[PDB]
Design a protein around this ligand. Structure first.
Ligand SMILES: CC(C)[C@H](C(=O)O)[C@@H](O)C(=O)O
Ligand SMILES: CC(C)[C@H](C(=O)O)[C@@H](O)C(=O)O
Ligand SMILES: [Mg+2]
Ligand SMILES: [Mg+2]
Lengths: 364, 364
């Protein structure tokens, strides 16, 4: 029936790229006869300014009434020096994840045709190309373990965080990774520190238990330090990476940077009943905000994940995805995607959204 | 007086590269009139085979009687399937670190002149070159925090590790990083997850406290996920990185791989009274063991750190270091350092050690 979306554009480039995502969405709504209602709520820095905290009660309620959250980016210099537990990025994201039980974080990263030169990889490695999906457990591990805090005074004052996982937690994220691999290149690389950590011993054990249900997918295990090395050297040999919360945080970023095109990457944070939060992979980039040069593709593709994962509108999702392909292969690139000699061909944020929306409309 | 060294060559390539380190050491001993006695002990896989555990009581005693440990590499396929708490790599390294209070892990990584092409970085980035010292806290954090273990059964079985730091622990490693930066490019980048972790909030606080004693060194803070990205893109802009135990484990590996020449890198794990363990940065490389092709330079340079840090023999350390430079610029390279078109010029492990030892002897 009529879908409800909580729009949380946040700070920096968030509102301007969100404008483009909504534009593209309007095209898909008209194409596929979707009936989607949107309500905007403040989150992050803007919420701190307007409401005194990064996740207002009305913002959370708004998300509880919605079928999905379409999320921009949060954070900036203006709030850097608040204490950590008042800061906008953590203060928005972790409580949304915890509250909605968004245990599943999906961050695909692919090296795009014709953008190899932007990859910080050596030209022969970037030429091989890569497509690595990071599947990261998002509501457990050391992010939410207790006890957490500090005790004591002076030299002996101590702080502490507890990484913990139960079998139930590990197997649910593992199944997501294996099921993803099934539809990709049939390999899961589980990434842990089982040589040091008791949580990792249990992780590696349970992922191997889950594997029995996927005789068709290869499973291998790698330690997180070695994975940072191998992703640099041979990223083409990984398909899906399965990670705990802290490890997937680290690895997903490394892989995104290896593309050299983070403005093209999006992410999906999902619970088990199809609600999720859909955001670009990269930050609020305050240094470029309000200028018309931010790449809106990550936000536009977030909207495509929203349509697929939460709204069960796979053709509309795929239409946005192909409209993005058409831009990228028809000379519609923003400045950060272009070599410095080709910079003068750069499209503005609005030109991008107008091109993408027009392709959806033309039946791409 | 007469120094005592516990030689723990371990598994895989460990003994063959250690043979070269001892060879070079003999040259320096003769050059500088050092009186160094060595005793070999089994560690790792060899210890499991000879003694039933990776760190025999006699091996630990041997290290307690020595001024330093000169350590090779441990681990291999043969022991992969033991349980984690019987495995050779963790079973050797963590108890040595904990026992000797080796809180300070130093892993410098530099891109060497003429070896840029081996770096997995894009040619323009490798051309800029880099020199990044990772300083990693090695005896605290989540490696040794308690409680550690698991409880429960079935779906609800849980495992847990506790990351903890006290101010005393953080400030002692911080001082090491700042003091290192003072002698390098006067920048410390402290790497943490202060947006999520209570240990990281305390870490970032204490590093800023320590900073007052170093008005000459710049301090900046970066989150570990962002640091994985930035090291790939602009490794030239970091000097010293200051990390907790899990984070430095991850980052040190990434940086080592970015050189594209890990057989040149060594590490120093030091306590506060000048005893340490000195090892190559890379693994036991069982696939090449016993063939005469392993690069002995990492092990040779480990011996140079041993001389400097534990034995207070700075001229002898520096002589080994220059002998290595001479090899690298006189066509003495092992196979993994050469492009596949220049492979046929590769030196064997013994040729390397003989060249390096001969340069020390000739007064390099
Ligand atoms: C801001 C921070 C809490 C967050 C995380 O650590 O999950 C961010 O790094 C991310 O990857 O979305
Ligand atoms: C084998 C493992 C315990 C060890 C560590 O995690 O410290 C290793 O990765 C290292 O970097 O020396
Ligand atoms: Mg992150
Ligand atoms: Mg390591």
């Amino acid at each position: 029936s009529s879908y409800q979306i909580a729009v949380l554009a946040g700070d920096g480039i968030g509102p301007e790229v969100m404008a483009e995502a909504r534009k593209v969405l309007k095209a898909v709504e008209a194409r596929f006869g979707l009936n989607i209602e949107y309500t905007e709520y403040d989150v992050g820095g803007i919420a701190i300014d307007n409401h005194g905290c990064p996740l207002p009660e009305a913002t959370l309620k708004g998300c509880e009434a919605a079928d999905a959250i379409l999320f921009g980016s949060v954070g900036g210099p203006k709030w850097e020096k608040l204490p950590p537990n008042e800061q906008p990025e953590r203060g928005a994201l972790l409580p949304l994840r915890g509250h909605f039980e968004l245990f599943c974080n999906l961050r695909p990263a692919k090296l795009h045709d014709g953008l190899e030169h932007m990859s910080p990889l050596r030209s022969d490695i970037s030429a091989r190309g890569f497509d690595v999906l990071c599947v990261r457990e998002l509501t457990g591990g050391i992010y939410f373990g207790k006890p957490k805090g500090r005790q004591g005074e002076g030299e002996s004052e101590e702080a502490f965080d507890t990484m913990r996982y139960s079998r139930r937690e590990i197997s649910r994220i593992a199944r997501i990774a294996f099921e993803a691999a099934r539809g990709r290149r049939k390999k899961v690389t589980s990434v842990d520190k089982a040589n040091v950590l008791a949580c990792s011993v249990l992780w590696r054990q349970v992922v191997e238990e889950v594997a029995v249900d996927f005789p068709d997918v290869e499973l291998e295990h790698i330690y997180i330090d070695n994975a940072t090395m191998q992703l640099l050297r041979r990223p083409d040999e990984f398909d899906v990476m399965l990670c705990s919360n802290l490890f997937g945080d680290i690895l997903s970023d490394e892989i995104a940077m290896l593309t050299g095109s983070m403005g093209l990457l999006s992410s999906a944070s999902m619970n088990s009943t199809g609600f999720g939060l859909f955001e670009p992979a990269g930050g609020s980039a305050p240094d470029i905000a309000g200028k018309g040069i931010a790449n809106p593709i990550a936000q536009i593709l977030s909207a495509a994940l929203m349509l697929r994962h939460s709204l069960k509108q796979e053709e509309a999702a795929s239409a946005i995805e192909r409209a993005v392909t058409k831009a990228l292969n028809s000379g519609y690139l923003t400045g950060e995607l272009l070599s410095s000699d080709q910079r003068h061909k750069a499209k503005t944020t609005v030109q991008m959204g107008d091109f993408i929306a027009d392709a959806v409309k033309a039946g791409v």
